[PDB]
Design a protein around this nucleic acid. Structure first.
Ligand code: MG
Ligand code: MG
Ligand code: MG
Ligand code: MG
Ligand code: MG
Ligand code: MG
Ligand code: MG
Ligand code: MG
Ligand code: MG
Ligand code: MG
Ligand code: MG
Ligand code: MG
Ligand code: MG
Ligand code: MG
Ligand code: MG
Ligand code: MG
Ligand code: MG
Ligand code: MG
Ligand code: MG
Ligand code: MG
Ligand code: MG
Ligand code: MG
Ligand code: MG
Ligand code: MG
Ligand code: MG
Ligand code: MG
Ligand code: MG
Ligand code: MG
Ligand code: MG
Ligand code: MG
Ligand code: MG
Ligand code: MG
Ligand code: MG
Ligand code: MG
Ligand code: MG
Lengths: 154, 34, 87, 66, 233, 124
RNA sequence: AAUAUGAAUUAAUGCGAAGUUGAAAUACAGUUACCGUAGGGGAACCUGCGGUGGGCUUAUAAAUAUCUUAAAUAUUCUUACA
RNA sequence: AGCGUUAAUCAUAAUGGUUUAAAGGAUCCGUAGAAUGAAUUAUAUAUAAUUUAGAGUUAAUAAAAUUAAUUAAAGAAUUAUAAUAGUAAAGAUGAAAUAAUAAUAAUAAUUAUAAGACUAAUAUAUGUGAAAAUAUUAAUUAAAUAUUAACUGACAUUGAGGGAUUAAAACUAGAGUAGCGAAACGGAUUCGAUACCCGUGUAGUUCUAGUAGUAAACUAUGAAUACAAUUAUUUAUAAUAUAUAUAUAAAUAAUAAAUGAAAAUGAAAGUAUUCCACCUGAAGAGUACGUUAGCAAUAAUGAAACUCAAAACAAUAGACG
């Protein structure tokens, strides 16, 4: 869900503000994907499944017995007295969800304000959902996927 | 509203009340039978 | 027991610090003499030495002999003694 | 021996090892590494002929400081 | 207190000045600070073990990991309320260090109040230099006290001479007692010897105490008389 | 300010302009007939004697119009053209009689700013 | 039926002019001020009832305190001693 | 070869706000919502089958005796009447008088009857209630906390319109009426005194049945969810080997960060998401007209013309009291 995603973004921002190292997130598929995307772009130092109490050392299979207590632990990242993941504003908010075609995404990438989105920035990452798979907006353009403009990290 | 600002409003309300008191018989005359 | 933590104050100080000095000797003697004269009529010689002692005390002046640093300490140690959280 | 459990600046959390006797206890391997780093920079400025200034306002510290 | 940027970014700020020409000459510290960089990564780092005990902080016991019946014979089939709450503050707040020896220490001084009256120097000599074999109590650098007993108890526990802790403690206590008795006898006999061979002690401990009391009493008496006089008048 | 609220009528208050001269009826001038011609006392603190006049326009509504210039020529019936200025010190007069046209004559011996009054070019 | 214009007489309100009567408010504004409401009064207002602080968090003592080698020992010590 | 001016149009700040400046509905309940809202997999934002983390249901085990409504009790005093004995003042105020005060024998005192209305300490409104509210006792009926066990399987959030409750005053009936007390009358005060003080003291305050639906109905701060750095206090829960030092929550008080016009807010006035209400210069005005509702007072709804370049808040330094 999108509300959840917004909440996790807010939590990430809060954690960046006070400089915590290792932070929990809810264990869902969309959320996991988002976390993986951040990790690959280079905003998170670590990403690992775990309990509500902490990250897991060994593998523990997730079932109806565990699922309520399961959690996604995430390492934050800092360099020269400045946090890497400064912001996590989402674009498609729950009330005004926005879905762009490939042309619109291209325009956004090339410095054009679209549907009241400030076009994407030098060291920024706009994530895009396309058939229940979160991608970079550039990646989506390359693959040519009309998708929901999810969120924005800087 | 500060107290000073409120005091103008209070004064206005008082004036209105006075006007209503004055125009009671007149109001009565106007109301009944029309 | 019920502890009572104050808020952050501008300055911990007692408004007036009492020294609690001893009462005057001459005054005491005078009171004793008065007490003696309550009994034994006006001026009987039971209080013959007491009157003399009073006179000796109150010869140069009516009273014989003529401050507590508590504010300085409170002022000094307020910032320490606070449970004021960090900056 | 760190300050106290109730006089805690949480900014210093990484440095502290655990609490005991109602007192935070400073991780001492960490202390060592930081001391070494500090010692090296002290040596370097002395080598370069820099002006080192030792500041110590507490009561007993004067003689050792001098 | 906000994380100060300007205490650790000193060389960068000076490097900029040097580039500009605001600074003609480089500082003495500049090269040194370049060589040895500051930390500048003021994070809250999480901790996963209590160092004293060796308990695990991070882990959660699952429903599948608790198959057998509970106290009051109910099988756990669900996560409880506490198993759902996100326990992140436990990872970050520093661990309360616990030792088995602390309890033994507490017990000993309850059992032996007058051992507290034996003065204790807390100013450490080189902690690395020592090397005590707790096969016996009497170590060289260390004095005889409840601590030594406790160390002996711990040694016994480790070696499994006494498998039970209580028995080991008792044994250590009994070892201590004999030593204490011997110490007591030594001093008395030394005193006797001194008395025999014409040694002269100017002030004995009891005499000293009496003298100390006397001054206090004298102080009290004058004050008390004044107070009585005050009361009278 | 919620998205739904915005949809059902909410936003910034659009401001452009409000009519300075309503009685003029959305046009540059209107012809009028002077009724009376006054000398008004201004607001405090500035003081003078302002040569205003009352004018019934052709559209019907009556208006207090200012008369500029040092001296003027206006009776109780003169044909006068009104424009939408405002005499700032006199309250309740939101108009100017335009001075070259009508029975109102051009202001005499005017050298500077002649078109602002009626004044023709003197022609050597 | 609705709308528009007119109406003797009449009410409110605005702007100007600073005249008269008091002095209600701002300080403990010389009866704490204001909310709701009711009654009274030339006029501000006054009085009852409950409410509010946008007035009192403006907050700052009934006082007494202890014994171990005072020194040939501590106090000195400049990478020495061990 | 136009330049001025007037009349117009577009641009020129919502890349806004509502504790204190315009602006949170008195409070909750709940309908619509073309408002928003968990998990996993598979179908070609939906369907389908599975989940239990939200939201509920019922037990069990601990606690708590509070809030409603109703019925039954208690208490210090107050006034009035009467008796007793007793003597000249009493009562009041800044100081005085007027009065159902007193030489018809008072006031004070001691008794004895009656009447209403209030609830000292404990008390912190701590707590409890949706908010108005709510502390003498008891009973009845209703509702209420936490943790476990089991079950339901997103059933939720918010909520236009709507609905219900809503202090004090007011009103309509019928009781009641000690004390207090608008008004009125009288005495003071004062230049005056339609006041502040004193005295008589009617409505009212009290109960029963209603009407009405407003208050500085205020935390001047709508509800919900996720999240973020410390400390100290209590409160409850669990374990500990009943009294210890521990783990949880909850509240209260200081703060970090952050936000902020600042004052300051501090788990919200922070970081975010959702839904509703409301604001768009000051006067005129919550006025007029109109409509609806009310026994009425009134309540809600709610304009325009006319006139200004003002008007407002936080804080600063003075002067002043
Ligand atoms: Mg306001
Ligand atoms: Mg000119
Ligand atoms: Mg010219
Ligand atoms: Mg008709
Ligand atoms: Mg007319
Ligand atoms: Mg006067
Ligand atoms: Mg007066
Ligand atoms: Mg007044
Ligand atoms: Mg006063
Ligand atoms: Mg006054
Ligand atoms: Mg006043
Ligand atoms: Mg009156
Ligand atoms: Mg009042
Ligand atoms: Mg005031
Ligand atoms: Mg104040
Ligand atoms: Mg715009
Ligand atoms: Mg409210
Ligand atoms: Mg309001
Ligand atoms: Mg609701
Ligand atoms: Mg509420
Ligand atoms: Mg009470
Ligand atoms: Mg009340
Ligand atoms: Mg009533
Ligand atoms: Mg009645
Ligand atoms: Mg009266
Ligand atoms: Mg009702
Ligand atoms: Mg009203
Ligand atoms: Mg209201
Ligand atoms: Mg209230
Ligand atoms: Mg701060
Ligand atoms: Mg903000
Ligand atoms: Mg604001
Ligand atoms: Mg605060
Ligand atoms: Mg109308
Ligand atoms: Mg109304």
């Amino acid at each position: 869900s999108l509300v959840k995603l917004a909440n996790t973004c807010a939590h990430l921002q809060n954690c960046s503000k006070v400089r915590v190292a290792l932070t929990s997130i809810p264990y869902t598929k969309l959320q996991l994907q988002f976390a993986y995307n951040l990790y690959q772009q280079g905003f998170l130092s670590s990403l690992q499944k775990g309990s509500t109490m902490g990250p897991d050392k060994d593998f523990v299979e997730v079932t109806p017995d565990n699922i309520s207590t399961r959690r996604l632990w995430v390492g934050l990242k800092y360099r020269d007295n400045k946090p890497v993941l400064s912001s996590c504003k989402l674009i498609s908010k729950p009330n005004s969800r926005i879905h762009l075609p490939m042309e619109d995404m291209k325009k956004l990438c090339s410095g054009v304000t679209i549907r009241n989105i400030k076009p994407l920035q030098p060291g920024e990452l706009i994530l895009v959902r396309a058939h229940n798979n979160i991608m970079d907006i550039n990646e989506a353009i390359s693959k040519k996927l009309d998708g929901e403009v999810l969120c924005r990290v800087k | 509203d500060s107290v000073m600002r409120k005091r103008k409003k209070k004064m206005k309300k008082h004036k209105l009340r006075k006007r209503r008191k004055r125009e009671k018989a007149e109001r009565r005359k106007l109301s009944q039978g029309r | 027991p019920p502890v009572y933590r104050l808020p952050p104050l501008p300055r911990l100080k007692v408004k007036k610090p009492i020294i609690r000095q001893e009462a005057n000797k001459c005054l005491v003697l005078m009171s004793n003499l008065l007490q003696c004269w309550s009994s034994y009529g006006h001026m009987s010689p039971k209080c013959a030495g007491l009157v003399t002692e009073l006179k000796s005390c109150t010869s140069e002046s009516a009273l014989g002999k003529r401050k507590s640093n508590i504010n300085y300490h409170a002022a000094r140690l307020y910032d320490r003694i606070n449970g004021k959280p960090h900056d | 021996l760190g300050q106290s459990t109730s006089l805690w600046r949480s900014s210093t959390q990484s440095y502290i090892y655990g609490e005991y006797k109602g007192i935070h206890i400073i991780d001492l391997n960490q202390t060592l590494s930081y001391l070494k780093r500090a010692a090296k920079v002290v040596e370097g400025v002395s080598e370069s002929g820099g002006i080192i200034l030792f500041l110590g306002t507490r009561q007993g510290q004067k003689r050792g400081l001098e | 207190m906000k994380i100060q940027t300007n205490a650790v970014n000193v060389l960068q700020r000076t490097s900029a000045y040097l580039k500009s020409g605001l600074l003609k000459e480089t500082p003495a510290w500049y090269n040194v600070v370049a060589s040895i960089p500051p930390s500048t990564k003021f994070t809250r780092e999480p901790r996963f073990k209590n160092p004293s005990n060796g308990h695990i902080i991070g882990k959660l016991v699952d429903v599948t990991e608790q198959p057998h019946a509970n106290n009051k014979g109910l099988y756990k089939t669900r996560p409880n309320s506490s198993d759902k709450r996100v326990g992140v503050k436990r990872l970050y707040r520093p661990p309360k260090l616990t030792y088995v020896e602390d309890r033994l220490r507490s017990l000993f001084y309850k059992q032996h109040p007058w051992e507290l009256s034996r003065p204790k120097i807390l100013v450490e000599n080189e902690i690395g230099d020592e090397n005590y074999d707790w096969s016996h109590m009497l170590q060289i650098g260390r004095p005889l006290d409840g601590e030594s007993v406790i160390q002996r108890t711990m040694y016994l526990i480790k070696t499994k001479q006494y498998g039970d802790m209580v028995e080991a403690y008792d044994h250590a206590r009994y070892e201590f007692y004999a030593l204490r008795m011997q110490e007591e006898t030594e001093q008395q006999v030394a005193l006797e010897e001194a008395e025999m061979f014409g040694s002269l002690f100017g002030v004995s401990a009891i005499e000293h105490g009496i003298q100390k009391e006397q001054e206090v009493l004298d102080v009290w008496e004058k004050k008390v008389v004044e107070e009585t006089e005050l009361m009278a008048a | 300010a919620t998205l739904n609220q915005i949809k059902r009528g909410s936003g910034p208050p659009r401001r452009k302009k409000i009519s300075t001269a309503p009685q003029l009826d959305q046009c540059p001038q209107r012809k009028g007939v002077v009724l009376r011609v006054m000398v008004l006392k201004p607001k405090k603190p500035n003081s003078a004697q302002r040569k205003a006049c009352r004018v019934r326009l052709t559209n019907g509504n009556v208006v207090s119009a200012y008369i500029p210039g040092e001296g003027h020529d206006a009776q109780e019936h003169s044909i006068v053209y009104v424009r939408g200025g405002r005499c700032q010190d006199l309250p309740g007069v939101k108009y100017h009689v335009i001075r070259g046209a009508g029975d109102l004559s051009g202001v005499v011996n005017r050298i500077s700013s002649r078109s602002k009054y009626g004044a023709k070019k003197p022609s050597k």
